């Protein structure tokens, strides 16, 4: 049985309905009861049972979480959205021996769109002494998660040379932070004059370019 988990990326503000919908290839219904189950995983924590069966709630589960559905279609709803609900929600089947979990829905709270603070870090001198160069493009306090970073080395797009690290949603700020590291050899780094970062985001009316010459 293959479980398809519609929307797996859901951003809803506090106090609003949030629906995660799991559809099964085959009927999970057997012996009359339903065997579709919902798990919650807080970052840094093991998965915890929320809904055993289609509707029955697990131990110590608030009334906010409600599971419904039958046959091949089920849904999990959290109307009184709270700060403690930011987690990863999985749908799982117990009808057949090979237990299959859903893709997983990452539920996060929503806030107003903010523009990214774009910063550029040239590599340190001692790094050039080590024969390596890493140039950093930084996006501070930007929402939503969607963001495009482009490295321009003397007006040339680079591909397969950048690594992006994104922090989780802040507990209070609720705004993301992104870092992009461009790694090159020292000889190759010293061969081009200008290094620029292109940031594309929903909060900007146009892509933002921040550049610096070598030295």
């Amino acid at each position: 049985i293959v479980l398809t988990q519609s929307p797996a990326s859901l951003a809803v503000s506090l106090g609003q309905r949030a629906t995660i919908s799991c559809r099964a290839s085959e009927s999970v219904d057997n012996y009359g009861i339903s065997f579709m189950n919902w798990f919650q995983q807080t970052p840094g924590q093991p998965p915890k049972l929320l809904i055993y069966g289609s509707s029955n709630q697990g131990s110590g589960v608030p009334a906010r979480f409600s599971g419904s559905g039958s046959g091949t279609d089920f849904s999990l709803n959290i109307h009184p959205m709270e700060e403690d609900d930011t987690a990863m929600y999985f749908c799982q089947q117990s009808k057949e021996v090979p237990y299959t979990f859903g893709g997983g829905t990452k539920l996060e709270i929503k806030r107003t769109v903010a523009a990214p603070s774009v910063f550029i870090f040239p590599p340190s001198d001692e790094q050039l002494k080590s024969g390596t160069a890493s140039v950093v493009c930084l996006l501070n306090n930007f929402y939503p998660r969607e963001a495009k970073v482009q490295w321009k080395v003397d007006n040339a797009l680079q591909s397969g040379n950048s690594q992006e690290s994104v922090t989780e949603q802040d507990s209070k700020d609720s705004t993301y932070s992104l870092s992009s590291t461009l790694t090159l050899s020292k000889a190759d780094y010293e061969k081009h004059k200008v290094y620029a970062c292109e940031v594309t985001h929903q909060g900007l009316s146009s892509p933002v370019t921040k550049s610096f010459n070598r030295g």
């Binding site: 117990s94 090979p98 893709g103 997983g104 922090t167 590291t181």
Partner: protein
Amino acid sequence: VQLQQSAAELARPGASVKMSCKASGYTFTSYTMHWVKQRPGQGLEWIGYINPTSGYTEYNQNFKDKTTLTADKSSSTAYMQLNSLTSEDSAVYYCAREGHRVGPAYWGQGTLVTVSAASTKGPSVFPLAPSSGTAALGCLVKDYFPEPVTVSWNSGALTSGVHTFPAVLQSSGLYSLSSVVTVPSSSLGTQTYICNVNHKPSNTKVDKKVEP
């Protein structure tokens, strides 16, 4: 009902690892114990379940060959053995107890299995200096193994605006993370900024000055 697992086992490719799950709070002779696999930041794949009272093991088709499940009712401990470890096997394995007609119902913490050919290496820490409102600076930790590295500013004297990005495994098999902070432009002249990095596996405690 609480379950206790092993802690963060590392192995070379092709090796085998034995992992222990210690039941607590129930008979351990009335509930089948399940084992599940989870890659970091990925989905869940149910590996297989063992019945403690009668040693009946049933495995997922993918894990039938490389996984062995055993139980010990005398010490109330289940064991999972992974053989022929590869890079695809590095993950966060979970132990679970049967309950409420759900296969995995009561999970226990989580054990990180790391399969790699690399070795314990010390982090290299480089100052990301401010460029010549709010200015930005930081430190970059590159080529360390294994995770994690604790990074702070002025031994925890600065916490506001400190972003410690998660580490990324490079093609070389090592980890790197950038810890950055935004500071007032006026503070560049007088305020001194130092980044403190701690790597317990390499036992390195290193402090670097960052200046414009």
